[PDB]
Every structure is written in structure tokens, then in C-alpha cells.
Design an enzyme around this catalytic site. Structure first.
Site, PDB file in Angstrom:
ATOM      1  N   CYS A   1       0.294   1.133 -14.367  1.00 31.76           N
ATOM      2  CA  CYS A   1       1.500   0.552 -13.714  1.00 31.76           C
ATOM      3  C   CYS A   1       1.116  -0.428 -12.609  1.00 31.76           C
ATOM      4  O   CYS A   1       1.721  -1.479 -12.478  1.00 31.76           O
ATOM      5  CB  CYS A   1       2.371   1.646 -13.074  1.00 31.76           C
TER       6      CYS A   1
ATOM      7  N   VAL B   1     -20.542 -39.824   1.002  1.00 36.11           N
ATOM      8  CA  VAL B   1     -21.841 -39.475   1.532  1.00 36.11           C
ATOM      9  C   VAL B   1     -22.120 -40.539   2.546  1.00 36.11           C
ATOM     10  O   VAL B   1     -22.048 -41.709   2.210  1.00 36.11           O
ATOM     11  CB  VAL B   1     -22.935 -39.551   0.458  1.00 36.11           C
TER      12      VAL B   1
ATOM     13  N   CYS C   1       0.799  -1.238   0.000  1.00 38.58           N
ATOM     14  CA  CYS C   1       0.000   0.000   0.000  1.00 38.58           C
ATOM     15  C   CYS C   1       0.831   1.289   0.000  1.00 38.58           C
ATOM     16  O   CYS C   1       0.309   2.355  -0.338  1.00 38.58           O
ATOM     17  CB  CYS C   1      -0.947   0.042   1.207  1.00 38.58           C
TER      18      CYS C   1
ATOM     19  N   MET D   1     -12.428 -40.941 -11.103  1.00 37.82           N
ATOM     20  CA  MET D   1     -11.116 -40.747 -11.724  1.00 37.82           C
ATOM     21  C   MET D   1      -9.955 -41.226 -10.865  1.00 37.82           C
ATOM     22  O   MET D   1      -8.929 -41.651 -11.395  1.00 37.82           O
ATOM     23  CB  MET D   1     -10.885 -39.274 -12.085  1.00 37.82           C
TER      24      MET D   1
ATOM     25  N   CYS E   1     -15.229 -38.274 -16.961  1.00 36.44           N
ATOM     26  CA  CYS E   1     -16.632 -38.416 -17.344  1.00 36.44           C
ATOM     27  C   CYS E   1     -16.907 -37.722 -18.663  1.00 36.44           C
ATOM     28  O   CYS E   1     -17.640 -38.259 -19.484  1.00 36.44           O
ATOM     29  CB  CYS E   1     -17.565 -37.884 -16.263  1.00 36.44           C
TER      30      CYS E   1
ATOM     31  N   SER F   1     -18.105 -41.292  -7.885  1.00 35.20           N
ATOM     32  CA  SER F   1     -18.637 -42.330  -7.011  1.00 35.20           C
ATOM     33  C   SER F   1     -17.855 -42.500  -5.704  1.00 35.20           C
ATOM     34  O   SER F   1     -18.399 -42.973  -4.712  1.00 35.20           O
ATOM     35  CB  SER F   1     -18.665 -43.658  -7.764  1.00 35.20           C
TER      36      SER F   1
ATOM     37  N   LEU G   1     -22.713 -43.184  -1.206  1.00 31.74           N
ATOM     38  CA  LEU G   1     -24.039 -42.819  -1.651  1.00 31.74           C
ATOM     39  C   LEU G   1     -24.674 -44.049  -2.242  1.00 31.74           C
ATOM     40  O   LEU G   1     -25.778 -44.405  -1.865  1.00 31.74           O
ATOM     41  CB  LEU G   1     -23.975 -41.686  -2.673  1.00 31.74           C
TER      42      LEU G   1
ATOM     43  N   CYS H   1     -17.033 -28.538  -7.153  1.00 36.68           N
ATOM     44  CA  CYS H   1     -17.274 -27.178  -7.636  1.00 36.68           C
ATOM     45  C   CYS H   1     -16.018 -26.334  -7.549  1.00 36.68           C
ATOM     46  O   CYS H   1     -15.947 -25.365  -6.794  1.00 36.68           O
ATOM     47  CB  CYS H   1     -18.411 -26.555  -6.846  1.00 36.68           C
TER      48      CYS H   1
END
Ligand SMILES: [Zn+2]
Ligand SMILES: [Zn+2]
Ligand SMILES: [Zn+2]
Lengths: 1069, 49
Positions: free
Chosen positions: A207, A1039, A202, A629, A651, A606, A611, A686
């Protein structure tokens, strides 16, 4: 600073003084720099002088050790940088493992690097990493902002901005339909302070590389927080309306019926309008949002004014979808109201975009509508398609019909009645909420509904020894339902007939074991299923009844209790009768006794198959295909599901392959084709957009070709009957809820019934606090399942299940808010049986050495014998940490703040010494002893002196250092409480990490793989694969099976319900 | 990995050659990792064991 040695020719590789000339007091050092942070191990240190630049080779004999320490700092910094280049998005716990497992060359005097070293060298490292971001320039996110780096900057008292040295994108495999959705949205909604001032960044004038890092971090950190309560959202279409001028309005034809009012089929209003057409109304401006409705009916009231009934539509913009929706798409709603034909403006064209005969096989202007939107639960569903009877062919409003069913379902009605006494009308059966309650059935009630028979100062601390204990200070779960058996239902009278409102129930009370004088000890080994009978009686309103349940006498049973208890929901049992006063257990009295289609399933992303497993347990599926994967996960999944074809490819590629006619992949496995896949589940990561602020150019780019987008394509191509997208709670708030909004939009374009909800794992029988976002979708034809009611009472703080979207509150159909049938599952229930192990345990298979202690344990081990206990293995922590753990006391709530400030022999030569307190903490004062509490010059308000920084202390220097600004690091080096729960899903337990309390409640070690697995609700039989951290990772990504079963059993109802409807319609055919 | 280290300019595909071919024979410009697939005319010489 001045320097001296032998200058050599730039090309000269030789580090001997041979072909060199010697210099002395070489001009004061301007700058010093670095380079080699990209390609090979070319980390070259270089000095800068007003005369020239020099690249250092090797140091003098005498300077060797000074340069020695400099070198370590640098090597660690290389590791971190290269690591983060390859693994942005890495978590604190990932570095610590990266560092710990990086084998340093003999060239470095050190054997291996530890967390301690990183912390010791935090300032240098971080500063170096900041430099690399200025140095090489991408539009990509600065490395110093990855989670691991921010976790470090916070933990270690790192100040930022200290400057120094320098020197084709993923394409998602979409479908035509899907592509267009995210393409058009880019093609539409897209557009476009206060630094710290104090930092060395700061204080430096296109530039511009004056980007404040202190700000940058806050921002990045803030961007990971959400907004968890606001009122139920107001109903639409209750505004004023504008009425048009009357010219010629007159009926046409003969009355359709008569009721004080008389109905017609046609009306003239200059042009023609017919019952079933749609009209538009104009409101009192306010905003100018044109109002469309379907003309349900038409009539002339007794007063001779001309009326129509308006079944309102709902604009897509006004559903959750908001902006994302097709501007021409409308939705049916339970909103309708009587109006004067005077309010209509113009008749409008509204086409029903119904699905095709082979909608399933179809993967790859005017107003239209597709689905029935429920504002409150955010359910898009297939329109009722009940057809008009001749007795209401003229009046026919779906909204009015729904509301009717909904009113009479809620209604407390009496089915069969008996004798009457005084003004009380005794009955044998009644109904509520769609449930029948007959005499001798049992019942759920709030804890307040009735009552049982009740029952009936610290001394100073040595602060020289426990200096940080002063930091120790600057609601729990409900009770499950009360259960009673019904005996009398005597009601009340509203003069002529019975008072439906004042229905009352006399019940025999049951005790749960821990309502008994046993209390908290009843609860341990006991089946959570079990009650005791009591001749104690009670009276409560029908209003307070929460549901029906099945309490049965153990000996009055034609199967095993286990068999009985697993057979269905809300089934309880008793064997003995309790007695409040004699407090003894006697036998009970004599008056106390008397196919499913498995969907073919592709599990995308998976993992080790959690799950899938809970869905297997529910009986509603068979996972024939999996895509994972990461080989170790895949390997593990296989082991647990031999029947599944487990693809390890990307996938995106496997999809392109099917979209090309390929029957098989490279390894020649069987690729699934249209029609194979009945249900499609998965947890797409995500990666580069999981944050809350608005979308950017940057952030959208990621999401557009994300695995969310790829997954949705699978759904569009394969067009399964069912669909499920699991993800972290905050999925529903990412990017100002657009990630969710677009996902729903894409499902609607496809023509799916769909919805969303947040679910707390702990509420379904796991000892853990972890909420997941769940996106359900069901094909037209099937019915859209509900989210499951909590089976376990749980700490309300955990159970914030609501979701705000565009400042509107969206809640799920879950009704149990707080209470439920069963008690909480504790860390004790979860792992109290497992034999003792010690830090660094590596034997994978070991004998159990003991029977199961808690209900829960009994369930995950099987109702039989099994010799081997698999994966009770835990990490081999550094002797330092091991020592710390050993010194963390066992009382519930203890953590680093209980450590003694003592010298400790650390196994080997090494000696973890005492923490020096050499500064005033001006906020925290002195100890009871008058001793200082400050560890750093920042405790006094000055800038931190480095080398006032200690390492290899039993009390970690860096915790007191940053304590005040990070809430005393409460929970660090904390032991799980036997009565508590897992703070989250643990993937790599580190005591100063971000995964919660991870010490074992009693043993001087961290939690084992198996213990985590138990925290997740995995059968002990369930297998994992590869080295310990691979296994830790596996369990914790999964899960939890009990959550998956729960959701699984909701799909059970949709199937059964949808199978018994084609069979009640095969008879009518 | 090793090849890369010695030839930085080379696009080093680790997929099965059978798949990389099917991909070119389908119009794909790039693989999964988004590397540059070679097309007709790119390759002047083709070696291998
Ligand atoms: Zn600043
Ligand atoms: Zn109506
Ligand atoms: Zn400081």
C-alpha cells in the site's frame, strides 16, 4: 465549514444561477481537492461531502475576494508544476524567472508575480507540488525534489508532508566499441531508513506511499555533497611472496655478460624461460591476487644463488579503473625488484596490443597490455619504446631506466665551475629539475626565502534600526614568489669534490610594486608583470629555488613591453630601481642591463565558445566545427567565429548521419568526416545522474544514454589526436567515481593515453573561485599533456585539487601548491573601470567614458582604442529588491544582515513596511534593547504559525525565520568585495539565490552581463546574443578563456615536442 | 504546438521532412526526441501542402 450556492448539472458550462437549484448549509466539508495539473488550464477546485462531491465554478459576490486570494495561490502552483514537469533539474533562479515572466490572466486580480509572492505562498505551493507526485505516479524523480524546490523549501521555512488533493527514452548514438563498454558494465556490477516520524506523511499506516519527504530532501541534498588530506597511496607489490620447491633449475647456454655477478639469456626450470618472457609469483595469501612480471634479467650472484629481475605489471583492477577494467588487461608500472628464481611459479603469455597502422581510421583469452600507468598522477600513457643497447641488452628494465632519468633530473648538478675561495666553489651555471641556471638569470623563491625593509575597537549598534546585525558573527592567498637575479653561486665541498647538496645563491632582490612603500596601491594600475630593481642582496639555498624566470630592463628592449610580456612565460620587467631607505625611484644601475600547428577542432557543446576561444588564444587550434543545440549560444559563437560551421542539431543525430555516409546535414552544411577533426573538445551535461551515491537501475539508465556516452562515441568514431572533456569539479566523484572510471575505461579500450585533473580557474588569472574537472586524452603517437602550473596565487581553501577514488588519493602533476608568480586578480582588477549604471540598465552599446585602470582591464580591451562598451546591461529588479539593494551598505562584507528595519516607499503606491518581531528566539535571546528577535512561533520551539509570516518587508521575513538553521544566510544580499572574487560562475544573478554574492560593490544594483564576462576573462570585443538572461546564461556556462589558454599551452608543448621528434628522426632516416 | 493542442493523439514531428525520410530509409524506429517514426504499412493516407 459549511457552504451554499446554486448546484448545476455536471455538463452545464453556464456560471450564472440559471439552470440550478439552490442549497444551504451544505454538509460539513470532508475534504477539498484539485485537478487539472497536466493537460490544459483546467484547474478545478472541488469540495467533498459525506453526501456528494462538487466542482466549483464561480463564487458569490461576497465570497469573491476570499476565493480571490485562494485563486492566486493556485495559479502560481500550476505554473510551478507545469514548469517542473518540463524542466526538472531547474535551478532556483530558473523559477524565479519563470514566475516573474509568467503573464497572469486578467481573471487573476494581480498584475504579475514576484519572488515575494512565491515566498509568501511557499507553504501552499510546495505542499501542492508534493501532492502532484503522489497523485500522478511515475518511477521518475518527484518534482518536489528538483533543486529549485529544495532551494525554496530551505529558504522559505517550509515544513513538508502536509497532504491534500489529487484528481520512448533517449537513445544515445554509440559506436560498437563504446556501446559494449557500458553494456557489459550493466551486465556485471549491478545489485541492491530512519524517517522523521513527526510528519503527517510518517503518521499514516505494498500500500505504502509513506515516503518521508523530510528524509527524502536530506537524502537528495546529501547526494550532492562530495569528500574533499589522506596520505599518498602506498605502492603495490611490496608484500611477501611464496617460493616454489627446487627440482631442476639450471642455466642454459653461455653467459650473456659479466658485471661480481654473471648474467644469462636462458634458464631451465623444468621447462624453458627466456629474458623477455613473463612470469607469475604468488604472494603470502593476504587476498590471493596473482602477481605477474616481465623477466628483465637473469643471473647468479657472488654467493651462487640464482636471481632474476622482475619488472612488475599492474592489474587493471588495481589502476584507477578498478572494477571497470578488462580482467585480462595489464599495465606497465615503475615497479620492479630483484628476486630469487625460486619465487617464480609459472611463465605466462603477455601480448602487447599495439595500435594499428591506421588506428586513426578504425572508428567503428590471454593477458595483454597496452599502456604505462603512473599510480600517483593517474596517467595512462604509450610505452616508452626505447630499445636495448648492447651494453645493457641483458639488464634492460624500463622501470629502472625511468627511475634513473627521474633521479638525475631531480639532482642538483654543476655544469661549469670557476675559482674557489676558502671551501666555497664558485660556478657560472648549474641545473635542477631539468632546468639550467646560469649567472645573471633570475629566479623564483618562496616568500619566506628572504626579507625586505618593513613598516609599522567598535561601538554599539542601534539594534532597533538594525535588528539582524547581531547575526553577523554567530586564511587568505599567499604572496607570490620572491624574485631575484643570480650573482654568485658558490656551493660547498664534500672533501674531494663539490658538495652538490649545499649549493647556495647570492641574489640581487627585486621588489614588486606592493613590496614597496606603495604596497596595496602599487598593485592596482601596475602591470602584474613589473618589478623594481634593488641593490639589496640575499643568500638562499638552491633547494628553495622554485624556477627560472626572465627579468629584463624595459629600455634594453628591441620590442614593446606589451609585445615582450606576451611573447612567453615567466617574463617580467623593470624600468626603475627602488631604494629601501631613501624610498625613491631612480634609474637602475649599469650592471642591471646587458611553425606551430593549429589543430582542426570540433567543439561539442560549444556554447558561445569560451573553451574554443582560450584554445584560439593559445594558438594550438582552429575550431572549424561546433555543435550547440541552444540557438542563442550558437548564434553568439558564429559571431565570434565566422569560419566555424556551427551545427545546432542534436549531436546524437549528427553522428548517426556521419555513420551513414552523409556528407551534409539538412541545411546543407559541411559534416566533418574521419581525418578532418584533429582535436575534439566539449562539456557534456550530466543531466540525470549527477550525484555521489552508488548507481541504481534509475541512475545508470540515464548515464548509459547520456551526452557523456555520446561524446565518447564522437571520440571513438573520429579518433582525434587530442581530446578534452570539461565538467564541474564534482564530475570526478559522481556515482562513487564511476562516471570518471567508466570514462577512462572507455578511453583505454579505444587505446588512448588519458588522465584527469581538477583545476581552479582563479589560479590562472580570473577573479573567481571555480574548479573544473578536466579529462585529457592524447592519441598514441602524440604525447599526453600535463596540467598547467597555477600562474596566480590564490586562496588555498579554493584550491583543493585532489581526488579520492576508492579511498586512494589521486593528484595531478601540478607542483605549485599555494604560491605562484603573479598576484591574485581582484574584483577591482576585473571591473573597476566600467561606467556607472543603475538597476535595470538596458542600453547594450554605450561609451566607455574612461580609460582602463587595472592591468587586467588593459588586457581585455586591447592595446588600442575601442569606443563602444557592449553588454553593460543589468537586470531590472523588482522595486522591493531594488530598495533592499539601495539599503545594503558599501563596507566589505555587508549583506542582508545590515539592512535597516524601516518603512520604504517602493516607487509606486506600494510601501515596504517594517518587520514585526513578535516571538522569543529561545536560542538567540533578546536584543540589546530587550526586544524580541523571533519572527515565527518556531523560534520558540512551537510549530510555525502561518500568517505569522510576513511579506514585502525590507528585511525579508523568511531570512530571520530560517536563519539559525542555515548559517544566517551569510552572503545573501551580499556585495562583492573589490578585493575579493566571484563566489562562482554566475548565470542569473539573484540576491537570495545560490550563485554567491551578486550585488555590485558600490552600486545599488546587481552585476551586469559584461561584469560577469570580465569575471570569466572574456575580451570586451567578445560578442553575445539575444535577451539579457540569454546573455547572462552564455557567459556563465562558458569555460573561462584564460583557463582554456592555459590548458591550450600545455597542448602547445606536446605538439612542438612531438614535431621536433619526427624532425630529429627524419634526419636519422 | 497548435496542431498538438487540437490533436493529442498525433505524433507531431517538427524536424525537416527530408531528414525524417532519410531516417526511415535507414531503419530508424525513432527520431532524436525518441518519437515513433512511421514505417511502411502504418500510413494509409498521406496529405500535405
Ligand atoms: Zn516524516
Ligand atoms: Zn628495474
Ligand atoms: Zn517557523
Amino acid at each position: 465549514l459549511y457552504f451554499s450556492g446554486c448546484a448545476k448539472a455536471i455538463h452545464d458550462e453556464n456560471p450564472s444561477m440559471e439552470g440550478g437549484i439552490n442549497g444551504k448549509n451544505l454538509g460539513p466539508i470532508n475534504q477539498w481537492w484539485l485537478s487539472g495539473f497536466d493537460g490544459g488550464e483546467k484547474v478545478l477546485i472541488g469540495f467533498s461531502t459525506a453526501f456528494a462531491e462538487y466542482i466549483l465554478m464561480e463564487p458569490s459576490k461576497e465570497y469573491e475576494p476570499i476565493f480571490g486570494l485562494m485563486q492566486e495561490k493556485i495559479y502560481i502552483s500550476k505554473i510551478v508544476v507545469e514548469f517542473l514537469q518540463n524542466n526538472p533539474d531547474a535551478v532556483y533562479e530558473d523559477l524565479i524567472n519563470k514566475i516573474e515572466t509568467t503573464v497572469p490572466p486578467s481573471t487573476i486580480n494581480v498584475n504579475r508575480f514576484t519572488e515575494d509572492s512565491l515566498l509568501r505562498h511557499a507553504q501552499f505551493v510546495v505542499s501542492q507540488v508534493e501532492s502532484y507526485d503522489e497523485a500522478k505516479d511515475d518511477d521518475e524523480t518527484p518534482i518536489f525534489l528538483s533543486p529549485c524546490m529544495r532551494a525554496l523549501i530551505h529558504l522559505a521555512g517550509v515544513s513538508l508532508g502536509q497532504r491534500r488533493a489529487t484528481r520512448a527514452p533517449t537513445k544515445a548514438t554509440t559506436t560498437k566499441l563504446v556501446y559494449q563498454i557500458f553494456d557489459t558494465f550493466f551486465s556485471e556490477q549491478i545489485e541492491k531508513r530512519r524517517r522523521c516520524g513527526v510528519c503527517e506523511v510518517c503518521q499514516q499506516p505494498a500500500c505504502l506511499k509513506r515516503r518521508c519527504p523530510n528524509l527524502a530532501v536530506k537524502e537528495a541534498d546529501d547526494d550532492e555533497e562530495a569528500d574533499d588530506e589522506m596520505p599518498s597511496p602506498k605502492k603495490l607489490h611490496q608484500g611477501k611472496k611464496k617460493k616454489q620447491n627446487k627440482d631442476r633449475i639450471s642455466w642454459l647456454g653461455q653467459p650473456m655478460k659479466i658485471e661480481r655477478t654473471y648474467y644469462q639469456k636462458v634458464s631451465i626450470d623444468e621447462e624453458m624461460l627466456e629474458v623477455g618472457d613473463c612470469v607469475s609469483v604468488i604472494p603470502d595469501d593476504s587476498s590471493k591476487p596473482l602477481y605477474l612480471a616481465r623477466v628483465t634479467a637473469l643471473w647468479e650472484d657472488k654467493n651462487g644463488q640464482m636471481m632474476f629481475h622482475a619488472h612488475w605489471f599492474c592489474a587493471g583492477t588495481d589502476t584507477v579503473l578498478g572494477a571497470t577494467s578488462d580482467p585480462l588487461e595489464l599495465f606497465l608500472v615503475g615497479e620492479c625488484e630483484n628476486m630469487q628464481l625460486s619465487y617464480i611459479h609459472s611463465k605466462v603469455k603477455v601480448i602487447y596490443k599495439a595500435p594499428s597502422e591506421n588506428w586513426a581510421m578504425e572508428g567503428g583469452k590471454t593477458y595483454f597490455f597496452q599502456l604505462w600507468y603512473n599510480q600517483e598522477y593517474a596517467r595512462f600513457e604509450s610505452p616508452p619504446k626505447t630499445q636495448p643497447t648492447e651494453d645493457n641488452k641483458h639488464k634492460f628494465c624500463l622501470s629502472c631506466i625511468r627511475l634513473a632519468e627521474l633521479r638525475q633530473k631531480e639532482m642538483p648538478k654543476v655544469l661549469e665551475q670557476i675559482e674557489e675561495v676558502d671551501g666555497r666553489v664558485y660556478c657560472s651555471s648549474i641545473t635542477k629539475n631539468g632546468v639550467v641556471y646560469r649567472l645573471g638569470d633570475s629566479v623564483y623563491l618562496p616568500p619566506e626565502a628572504f626579507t625586505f625593509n618593513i613598516k609599522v575597537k567598535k561601538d554599539p549598534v542601534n539594534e532597533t534600526l538594525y535588528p539582524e546585525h547581531y547575526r553577523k558573527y554567530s586564511l587568505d592567498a599567499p604572496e607570490p614568489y620572491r624574485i631575484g637575479r643570480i650573482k654568485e653561486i658558490h656551493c660547498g665541498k664534500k672533501k674531494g669534490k663539490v658538495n652538490e647538496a649545499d649549493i647556495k645563491l647570492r641574489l640581487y632582490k627585486f621588489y614588486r610594486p606592493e613590496n614597496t612603500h606603495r604596497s596595496y596601491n602599487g598593485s592596482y594600475h601596475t602591470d602584474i608583470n613589473m618589478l623594481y630593481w634593488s641593490d639589496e642582496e640575499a643568500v638562499v639555498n638552491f633547494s628553495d629555488v622554485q624556477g627560472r624566470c626572465t627579468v629584463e630592463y624595459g629600455e634594453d628592449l628591441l620590442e614593446s613591453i606589451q609585445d615582450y610580456s606576451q611573447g612567453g612565460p615567466d617574463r617580467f620587467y623593470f624600468l626603475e630601481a627602488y631604494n629601501s631607505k631613501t624610498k625613491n625611484f631612480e634609474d637602475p644601475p649599469n650592471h642591471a642591463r646587458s611553425k606551430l600547428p593549429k589543430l582542426r577542432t570540433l567543439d561539442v557543446f560549444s556554447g558561445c565558445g569560451g573553451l574554443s576561444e582560450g584554445f584560439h588564444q593559445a594558438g594550438i587550434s582552429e575550431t572549424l566545427w561546433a555543435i550547440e543545440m541552444w540557438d542563442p549560444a550558437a548564434q553568439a559563437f558564429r559571431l565570434n567565429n565566422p569560419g566555424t560551421t556551427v551545427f545546432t542539431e542534436d549531436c546524437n543525430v549528427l553522428l548517426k548521419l556521419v555513420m551513414a555516409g552523409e556528407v551534409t546535414n539538412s541545411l546543407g552544411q559541411r559534416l566533418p568526416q574521419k581525418g578532418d577533426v584533429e582535436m575534439l573538445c566539449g562539456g557534456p551535461p550530466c543531466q540525470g545522474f549527477s550525484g555521489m551515491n552508488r548507481f541504481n537501475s534509475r541512475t545508470y539508465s540515464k548515464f548509459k544514454n547520456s551526452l557523456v556516452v555520446s561524446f565518447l562515441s564522437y571520440c571513438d568514431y573520429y579518433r582525434p589526436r587530442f581530446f578534452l572533456l570539461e565538467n564541474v569539479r564534482n564530475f570526478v566523484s559522481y556515482r562513487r567515481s564511476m562516471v570518471l572510471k567508466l570514462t577512462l575505461r572507455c578511453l583505454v579500450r579505444m587505446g588512448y593515453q588519458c588522465t584527469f585533473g581538477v583545476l581552479q580557474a582563479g589560479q590562472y588569472g580570473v577573479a573567481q573561485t571555480r574548479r573544473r574537472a578536466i579529462i585529457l586524452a592524447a592519441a598514441p603517437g602524440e604525447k599526453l599533456p600535463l596540467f598547467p602550473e597555477p600562474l596566480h596565487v590564490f586562496a588555498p581553501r579554493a584550491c583543493q585539487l585532489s581526488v579520492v577514488v576508492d579511498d586512494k588519493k589521486f593528484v595531478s602533476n601540478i607542483t605549485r601548491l599555494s604560491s605562484g608568480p603573479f598576484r591574485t586578480i581582484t574584483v577591482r582588477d576585473t571591473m573597476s573601470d566600467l561606467p556607472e549604471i543603475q538597476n535595470g540598465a538596458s542600453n547594450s552599446e554605450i561609451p566607455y567614458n574612461g580609460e582602463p585602470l587595472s592591468w587586467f582591464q588593459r588586457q581585455l580591451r586591447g592595446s588600442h582604442y575601442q569606443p563602444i562598451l557592449r553588454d553593460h546591461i543589468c537586470k531590472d529588479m523588482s522595486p522591493l529588491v531594488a530598495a533592499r539593494m539601495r539599503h545594503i551598505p558599501l563596507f566589505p562584507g555587508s549583506d542582508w544582515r545590515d539592512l535597516p528595519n524601516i518603512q520604504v516607499r517602493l516607487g509606486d503606491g506600494v510601501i515596504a513596511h517594517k518587520l514585526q518581531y513578535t516571538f522569543h528566539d529561545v536560542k538567540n535571546g533578546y536584543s540589546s534593547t530587550g526586544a524580541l528577535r523571533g519572527v515565527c512561533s518556531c523560534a520558540e520551539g512551537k510549530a510555525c504559525d502561518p500568517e505569522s509570516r510576513q511579506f514585502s518587508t525590507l528585511i525579508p521575513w523568511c531570512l530571520p525565520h530560517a536563519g539559525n538553521r542555515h548559517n544566517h544566510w551569510a552572503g545573501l544580499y551580499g556585495r562583492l568585495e573589490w578585493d575579493g572574487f566571484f563566489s562562482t560562475t554566475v548565470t542569473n544573478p539573484e540576491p537570495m539565490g545560490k550563485q554567491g554574492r551578486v550585488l555590485h560593490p558600490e552600486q545599488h544594483r546587481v552585476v551586469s552581463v559584461r561584469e560577469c564576462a570580465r569575471s570569466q576573462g572574456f575580451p570586451d570585443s567578445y560578442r553575445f546574443f539575444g535577451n539579457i538572461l540569454d546573455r547572462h546564461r552564455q557567459v556563465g556556462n562558458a569555460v573561462p578563456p584564460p583557463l582554456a589558454k592555459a590548458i591550450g599551452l600545455e597542448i602547445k608543448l606536446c605538439l612542438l615536442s612531438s614535431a621536433r621528434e619526427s624532425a630529429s628522426a627524419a634526419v636519422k632516416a
